[PDB]
From a paper:
[name] (At) carboxylesterase 15 (CXE15) and carboxylesterase 20 ([name]) have been shown to deplete strigolactones (SLs) that coordinate various growth and developmental processes and function as signaling molecules in the rhizosphere. Here, we elucidate the X-ray crystal structures of AtCXE15 (both apo and SL intermediate bound) and [name], revealing insights into the mechanisms of SL binding and catabolism. The N-terminal regions of CXE15 and [name] exhibit distinct secondary structures, with CXE15 characterized by an alpha helix and [name] by an alpha/beta fold. These structural differences play pivotal roles in regulating variable SL hydrolysis rates.
Similar to AtCXE15, the overall structure of [name] is divided into two domains: cap domain (residues 1–26) and the catalytic core domain (residues 53–327) both of which are also connected by a long linker loop (residues 27–52). Unlike CXE15, [name] features a catalytic triad composed of Ser-His-Asp (instead of Ser-His-Glu), and both enzymes exhibit similar catalytic pockets, predominantly lined with hydrophobic residues. Strikingly, in contrast to AtCXE15, the cap domain of [name] comprises of NT α1 helix and anti-parallel β-sheet (β1 and β2), which we termed NT-α/β. Moreover, the loop connecting the NT-α/β to the core is longer in [name] compared to the loop connecting the NTH in AtCXE15 that is replaced by an extra β-strand. The main difference between the pockets can be attributed to the presence of negatively charged and hydrophobic residues in CXE15, and positively charged and hydrophobic residues in [name]. Notably, the presence of F31 and R307 in [name] may hinder the proper orientation of the ABC-ring of SLs and their dynamics resulted in larger pocket size (from 303 A2 to 620 A2), and can explain reduced enzymatic activity. CXE15 demonstrated much greater activity towards YLG hydrolysis than [name] with kcat values of 0.84 s−1 and 0.021 s−1, respectively.
Author numbering: 6 to 70, 78 to 326
Amino acid sequence: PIADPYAYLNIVNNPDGSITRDLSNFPCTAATPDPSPLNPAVSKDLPVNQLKSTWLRLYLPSSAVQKLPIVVYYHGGGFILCSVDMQLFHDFCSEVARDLNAIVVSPSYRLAPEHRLPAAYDDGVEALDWIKTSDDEWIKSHADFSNVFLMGTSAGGNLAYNVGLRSVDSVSDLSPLQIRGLILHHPFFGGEERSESEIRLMNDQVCPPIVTDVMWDLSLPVGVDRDHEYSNPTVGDGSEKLEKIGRLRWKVMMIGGEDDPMIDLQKDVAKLMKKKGVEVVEHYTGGHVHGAEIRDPSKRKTLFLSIKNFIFSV
């Protein structure tokens, strides 16, 4: 059982409210714009916001270099760790582009505690503003603006959900982008009281509650606890934006693993969405730990096939 969450996360507390991250465990890799048989996608980097130092990586199936659906992908890491150019996420997004036959837009976002929530959400929203006005040749030649999906893994799935909530009152300004769906891949949600699955899976070795407590403590706004809507979408009666999501027919795909301590809350978020009139496609798998398909590439294909079916289903 994980005894020390900070050592598990490879972080140290710093006397100004920051943390020191040991990056050596997660190597980064560069974009590769020229097609290569070793690379499932071509990729390139573009800046978004100079003040925030935010940017994004574009991915295109090697074959593309007949417009493709736009999958905006937000990476995971508890809102406190990890980057777009981490090999782990770069390889995943490249295979997403190839196997969905999609253009994948993977935006960076600022990390907590240096930039607590809702900073990441603001950055996730700004990435859509960027797509809408981009003159980039890959966007202009290959991106189907009518078929936008907001995707994310773990914290990125929480991020994608909250970008969806923030876009619902903004749909006029999103044009010529049209959002069709949200794809929530093991989204990072937690509450104050332990859920049934957090108790049952208390000794998880991937993302146990002792570790997520730390991540929420570092990323939530100063002064709030885990029953805030940022971490727990079910508090009260959920957002008053879910019914609108349902009326606009944005579909939501909720992907969860049954050995993830987060699973009870993830399933209850899907229930709430359905009660609010959202069309929810649920994809739950026994024996899968948090981030299963990130850590095990041999699980990716059937996930990608289900996502492709979801995308075609709109």
